[PDB]
């Protein structure tokens, strides 16, 4: 059938010979390390792609008086000085469709997995406006992470930005990966953008996803440290557009930027290669606008817009715990609450090392359900006040009994929040855990038997009583009836744990 | 890409170049923004001397540069 497809191609050729159009084309002047000052090209837009002699795409950023500052989207090796470059007429369009589900792709939406090109008809711009004041509604659904700490104290909701900030090897990638992997039964679209990271790291992530099952609903917008600065800069915006395609069409999405500091570093690099003035510590002034323009597009759309959602969970890195740095303070300003991960809590055993004292969630109980709100509305303030009471009562020699019992219960609470790697907890387990903890049942048994007793109690309710899970699922409220069932179960399991 | 060279002053000099004549009687406003104004002419103005813009805006000649009075 080689000739008949060639016959259709030739039937296209007789109708596709030439199109008349005033292609704006200019001469290349200076070519150095990804930036090319261009002569000519006076009717080009801002941010319009140009195509060089090599086929190298650019983006016309600085329309100076004489020349046109153009960033190359790749290498400038084969671009010869004086060779011509043609403008395209588009502004950072990317193809987008449902086929991207499962396909790790480059920042130009090119499949680096080699599994064929993506069937994408509709195209959405890379840069889009943020949803207005009336194009959103208040966040009310919860976005389950699986972690008891994040799911109870500092909750995250469908349509909220939440920053994962912390040091090296403090579990930020693991937090994001577990938050993605818990989505397997909630039907959301996952996006994991990787900006300036190890190719081997991305390979490990896509292997973990593919073998755990999280690739039926995930995309990976990755480019490594080798990739050009403009690709490291366009990766988050391309991931955002890919997510927003779903977000507008009545879907719930979840995008993670691991990490953002590499994007801001690449944008700083290209700003300094365009000879723009460097602001404080070599970062340009507009880096705040850079991050805010990207982040303000994650919202919870109103009913008229289909009540679509997009939860953005970006990841940044602080060096030696220096939150006072430029990009850390910029991101903790833009996002809607932040989750600080501390290497101190990491070494000391507290894993995942959520430092809730300096962690916040700007949605509150509206990023939980009625059951988890009833069980843990006051828990964050009480746990911070108990962190004080346990930190201050190291100075006093002897304590009065009320404070001693509050201190012991707070220590039990601290043993509850330990969560292993790759382990999600459902809403039923989370509610029953916070109940059996806060209500003072674990005040007796020791800090080390706490966790094993918790495991045994949840195993017990799973085997014996299904109506607890049925209630918290179908009704979604920690009713008096469900609490009656739960207290029966806790007493039975406490007696069993005693006799064993 | 130089200050003080506005392509109208070069016109006036091309007309009247014959020899370099005192121009302190006059003075023109080349660039004005954010509270300062670069001024041509005024070749005998002192440093610190009040210079009075038309429309009534007093100024002070702080740094006398090569061919422009900041």
């Amino acid at each position: 059938r080689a000739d008949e497809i060639s016959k259709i191609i030739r039937e296209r050729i007789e109708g596709y010979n030439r199109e008349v159009k005033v292609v704006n084309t200019g001469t290349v002047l200076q070519v150095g390390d990804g930036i090319a000052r261009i002569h000519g090209l006076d009717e080009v837009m801002a941010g319009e792609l140009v195509e060089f002699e090599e086929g190298t795409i650019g983006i016309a950023l600085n329309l100076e008086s004489n020349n046109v500052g153009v960033v190359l989207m790749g290498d400038g090796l084969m671009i010869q000085e004086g060779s011509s470059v043609k403008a395209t007429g588009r502004i950072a369009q990317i193809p987008v469709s449902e086929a991207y589900l499962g396909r790790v792709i480059n920042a130009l939406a090119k499949p680096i997995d080699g599994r064929g090109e993506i069937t994408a008809s509709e195209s959405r711009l890379i840069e889009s406006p943020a949803p207005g004041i009336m194009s959103r509604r208040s966040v009310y659904e919860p976005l389950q992470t699986g972690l008891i700490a994040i799911d109870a104290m500092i909750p995250v909701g469908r349509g909220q930005r939440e920053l994962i900030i912390g040091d090296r090897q403090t579990g930020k990638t693991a937090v994001a990966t577990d938050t993605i992997l818990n989505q397997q039964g909630q039907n959301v679209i996952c996006v994991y953008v990787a900006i300036g990271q190890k190719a081997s790291s991305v390979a490990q992530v896509v292997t973990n996803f593919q073998e755990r099952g999280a690739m039926e609903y995930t995309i990976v917008v990755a480019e490594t440290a080798d990739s050009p600065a403009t690709l490291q800069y366009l990766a988050p915006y391309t991931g955002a557009a890919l997510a927003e395609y779903f977000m507008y069409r009545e879907r719930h999405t979840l995008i993670i930027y691991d990490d953002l500091s590499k994007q801001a570093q690449a944008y700083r690099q290209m700003s300094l290669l365009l000879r723009r003035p460097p602001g404080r510590e070599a970062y340009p002034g507009d880096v705040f606008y850079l991050h805010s323009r990207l982040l303000e597009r994650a919202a919870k759309l109103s009913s008229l817009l289909g009540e679509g959602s997009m939860t953005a969970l970006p990841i940044v890195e602080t060096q030696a715990g220096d939150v006072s740095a430029y990009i850390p303070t910029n991101v903790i300003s833009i996002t809607d609450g932040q989750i600080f991960l501390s290497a101190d809590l990491f070494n000391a055993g507290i894993r995942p090392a959520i430092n809730v004292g300096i962690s916040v969630s700007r949605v509150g109980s509206a990023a939980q359900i009625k059951a988890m709100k009833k069980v843990a509305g006051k828990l964050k303030l009480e746990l911070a006040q108990f962190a004080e009471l346990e930190a201050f009562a190291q100075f006093a020699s002897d304590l009065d009994k009320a404070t001693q019992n509050q201190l012991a219960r707070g220590q039990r609470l601290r043993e509850l929040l330990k969560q292993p790697q790759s382990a999600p907890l459902t809403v039923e387990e989370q509610v029953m855990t916070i109940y059996t903890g806060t209500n003072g049942y674990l005040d007796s048994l020791e800090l080390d038997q706490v966790r094993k007793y918790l495991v045994e109690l949840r195993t017990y309710v799973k085997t014996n009583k299904p109506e607890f899970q049925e209630i918290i699922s179908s009704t979604k409220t920690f009713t008096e009836e469900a609490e009656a069932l739960l207290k029966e179960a806790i007493q039975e399991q406490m007696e069993r744990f005693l006799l064993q | 890409i130089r200050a003080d060279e506005i392509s109208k002053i070069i016109r006036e000099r091309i007309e009247g170049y014959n020899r370099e004549v005192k121009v302190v009687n006059t003075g023109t406003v080349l660039q004005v923004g954010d509270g300062i104004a670069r001024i041509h002419g005024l070749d005998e103005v002192m440093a610190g001397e009040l210079v009075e813009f038309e429309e009534g805006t007093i100024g002070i000649a702080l740094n006398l540069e090569s061919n422009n009075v900041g």
């Binding site: 006076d42 009717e43 080009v44 837009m45 801002a46 600085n62 329309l63 100076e64 008086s65 502004i91 840069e127 406006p129 943020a130 207005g132 004041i133 009336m134 959103r136 208040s138 349509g159 723009r276 003035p277 602001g279 002034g285 705040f288 606008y289 323009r293 303000e296 597009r297 919870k300 740095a325 303070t329 903790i332 300003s333 833009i334 809607d336 004292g357 700007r362 509150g364 109980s365 509206a366 509305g377 006051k378 964050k380 303030l381 009480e382 911070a384 006040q385 004080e388 100075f395 020699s397 009320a402 019992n405 | 200050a3 506005i6 080349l30 660039q31 004005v32 923004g33 954010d34 509270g35």
Partner: protein, 480 residues
């Protein structure tokens, strides 16, 4: 209008346009760039002349997105600063930097408009009355008595609670205020603005049923907008409120959030305009920028603009130039401390660093003054002692030393309060606490009546009878 310019250089929102020889726009005038929407129709992008830079060229900052705007495009010279519609056509309506309606409702009645860039009132025009109002927050109404008809300030990093504090203050003061409130949203989150709007709808403030019955006007300079809007939405909302105070001669509430983002936008736009960077990165025109905002915002004989505005502090450093500069213009200042926020004491108003100008005997009453001074004294003793205790131990202190330590911990608890809007954060209901109840409770806690109650009984309580009842509840819970 007739003199048409040509776009010459576009570097982000900092543009360069050339004009015919002798017809050049004026500084701060508005320019309309005849843009192009992606479908070929025009997309008008406004600008504002910043700097006449020679050879018929002017540098104007675009109040909109600069992408898509080619060189050599058409530009007009409107002949006026950015004018905004003022009066009763603003009540109940959400706006832009340019005064455009963005709540997707009827177009505003243009009829009354007033240009943004105007002068401050003169020295003879100042109202010199000194009086405090009741805000319903314990620490505020005791230690930082706000000045009715002045300028208040909320300082702190992010996540410490100045937006929630400004929401609490809106809740308490807006409806009791007999006049009109104004809210300028500057560099704040779109979902923050939307939640505020949904609350102003549900709480019946705007009275959506009858527009032009509302007592509120909304201007939002969100963070997605270019530096032009983040620069000028404060001045927009200020010109609206200034009309309200000028001719409608009624008291105004002017909540601003966030005010640091205005200086942020100035700093972003400065270096690209041509200015040399000053210290840590702010513009050279920082002091006069803050002047052109604050000194325009003042109370006069006709009207009184009460302005409760929140200053972001980058990395909790009050040495940062913009927080340092706002301090000189803000009468009553409150500083939020990450220690108080992190420990769980909310609101996190650092009391010893927070100061007002109203806390003077003749103005607040001798009893209120003496109790404020005693509270600050005990907290300062506690903080001057705290690290010595942390090293030494607690037993080795004298009777009065341990006594004041216990009382100061209890006072640190009692300056906390459940907020009306922070229900989703705390779980308890918000309590309005009166000044008499606060003064009485702090008098008791300082005199040592309650000197055996649990310190935790003083945590998230409105009144002092609530703290006694909570002590009763904990006492019974211990007996069970």
């Amino acid at each position: 209008k007739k003199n048409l310019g040509r776009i010459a250089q576009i570097i982000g929102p900092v543009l360069d346009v050339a004009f015919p020889p002798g017809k050049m726009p004026n500084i701060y005038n508005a320019l309309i760039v005849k843009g192009r929407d992606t479908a070929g129709q025009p997309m008008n992008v406004t600008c504002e002349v910043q700097q006449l830079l020679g050879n018929n060229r002017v540098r104007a900052v675009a109040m909109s997105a600069t992408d898509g705007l080619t060189r050599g495009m058409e530009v007009i010279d409107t002949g006026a600063p950015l004018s905004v519609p003022v009066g009763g056509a603003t009540l109940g309506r959400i706006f832009n930097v340019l005064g455009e309606p963005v709540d997707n409702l009827g177009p505003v009645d243009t009829r009354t408009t007033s240009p943004i860039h105007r002068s401050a009132p003169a020295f003879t025009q100042l109202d010199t009355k000194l009086s405090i109002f009741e805000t319903g927050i314990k620490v505020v109404d005791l230690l930082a008595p706000y000045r009715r008809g002045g300028k208040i300030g909320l300082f702190g990093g992010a996540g410490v609670g100045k937006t929630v504090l400004i929401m609490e203050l809106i809740n308490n003061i807006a409806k009791a205020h007999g006049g009109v409130s104004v809210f300028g949203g500057v560099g704040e989150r779109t979902r923050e603005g939307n939640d505020l709007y949904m609350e102003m709808k549900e709480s019946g403030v705007i009275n959506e049923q009858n527009i032009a019955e509302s007592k509120v006007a909304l201007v939002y300079g969100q963070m997605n907008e270019p530096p032009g809007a983040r620069m000028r939405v404060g001045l927009t909302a200020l010109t609206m409120a200034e009309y309200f105070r000028d001719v409608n001669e009624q008291d105004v509430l002017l909540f601003i959030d966030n005010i640091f983002r205005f200086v942020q936008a100035g700093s972003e736009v400065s270096a690209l305009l041509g200015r040399m960077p000053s210290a840590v990165g702010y513009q050279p025109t920082l002091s006069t920028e803050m002047g052109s905002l604050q000194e325009r915002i003042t109370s006069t004989k006709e009207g009184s603009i009460t302005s409760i505005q929140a200053v972001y502090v980058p990395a909790d450093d009050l040495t940062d130039p913009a927080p340092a500069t706002t301090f000189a213009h803000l009468d009553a200042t409150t500083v939020l401390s990450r220690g108080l926020a992190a420990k769980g004491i909310y609101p996190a108003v650092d009391p010893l660093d927070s100061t007002s100008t109203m806390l003077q005997p003749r103005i607040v009453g001798e009893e209120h003054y003496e109790i404020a001074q005693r509270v600050k004294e005990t907290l300062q003793r506690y903080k001057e002692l705290q690290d010595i205790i942390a090293i030494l131990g607690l037993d080795e202190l004298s009777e009065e030393d341990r006594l004041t330590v216990a009382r100061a911990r209890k006072i640190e608890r009692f300056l906390s309060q459940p907020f009306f809007v922070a229900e989703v954060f705390t779980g308890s209901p918000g309590k309005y606490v009166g000044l008499a109840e606060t003064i009485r409770g702090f008098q008791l806690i300082l005199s040592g009546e309650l000197d055996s109650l649990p310190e935790q009984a003083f945590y998230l309580v409105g009144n002092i009878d609530e703290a006694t009842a909570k002590a009763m509840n904990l006492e019974m819970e211990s007996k069970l």
